[PDB]
Design a protein around this nucleic acid. Structure first.
Ligand SMILES: [Ca+2]
Ligand SMILES: [Ca+2]
Ligand SMILES: [Ca+2]
Ligand SMILES: [Ca+2]
Ligand SMILES: [Ca+2]
Ligand SMILES: [Ca+2]
Ligand SMILES: [Ca+2]
Lengths: 127, 128
DNA sequence: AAAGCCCCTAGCTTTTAGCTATGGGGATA
DNA sequence: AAAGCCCCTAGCTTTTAGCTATGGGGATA
DNA sequence: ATTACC
DNA sequence: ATTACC
């Protein structure tokens, strides 16, 4: 199952994890549900397919298929950036002793249908 | 085993495949060896780790770890663009029998340690 | 120590903001 | 038909080149 | 204003 | 000028 843009046929799926500033346990309750809505809205607007997404109290997991030419960091900057603006506009406690909602950092890991040990079998390495 | 730049901790591995123009079986002999020489130079110069690379006459496989902020496309653009420029200077048959060495297209497939269905179940069951 | 904390610039969105950049500099303990 | 074929612009490298762009048009017939 | 998700 | 890469 592969998508394509004008020039690239691709399957670029990323496991994305980022945490709030100071790793606060704020991704619960109304903030959690509203965070998921904003990300879903960003993905739709940016042509990103959210395969799975779930918060875990002080961090969020996202499994997203992103156009490799568009860039994974552009989706991440947009997701974290807009969600920070809106959630801090809608939830005052997200500005209390919080200079920002997110950190400058995140975790990214590529994911495919086949694991890495299987895909290396596709290729006879000539190094 | 994860890497990190200034802000991102990542493991971004891509199975990349692209073919010569018209799918001509030109990736043999000295063209094959010289092509892999140039991509090694591009990888080292662009901080890209080449896990595995194989040419097979009419296509090249590359399994590579690429900085996600740098972008998989900037590596592909440089690897294809520079190899096309150099090999067409050094092999007359590549400059006279083809308008370009490569096509405008490629294949990109991400890969990690776990299968997709396992990561999917793992993310879905986070809240218990 | 760093990804995560503090500090800085510049770029681009979310712009009397708040995230990136294969971005930089630190102490704390 | 499209990723792959022919055409284009525009950005950046490899620059009396040749690749990208979440880029566009099209015929094959 | 932090302390760790893979 | 192509026809498909575990
Ligand atoms: Ca096209
Ligand atoms: Ca978790
Ligand atoms: Ca192998
Ligand atoms: Ca093979
Ligand atoms: Ca830094
Ligand atoms: Ca640590
Ligand atoms: Ca086809």
């Amino acid at each position: 199952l592969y998508k394509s843009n004008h020039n690239v046929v691709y399957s670029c799926k990323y496991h994305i994890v980022w945490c709030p500033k100071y790793r606060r346990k704020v991704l619960v309750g109304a903030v959690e549900m509203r965070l998921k809505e904003i990300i879903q809205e960003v993905a739709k607007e940016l042509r990103v397919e959210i395969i799975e997404m779930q918060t875990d109290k002080d961090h969020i997991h996202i499994l997203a298929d992103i156009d490799p030419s568009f860039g994974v960091m552009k989706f991440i900057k947009t997701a974290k950036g807009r969600s920070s603006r809106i959630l801090r506009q809608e939830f005052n406690h997200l500005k209390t002793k919080l200079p920002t909602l997110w950190t400058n950092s995140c975790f990214i890991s590529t994911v495919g249908g086949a694991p890495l040990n299987v895909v290396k079998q596709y290729i006879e390495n000539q190094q």
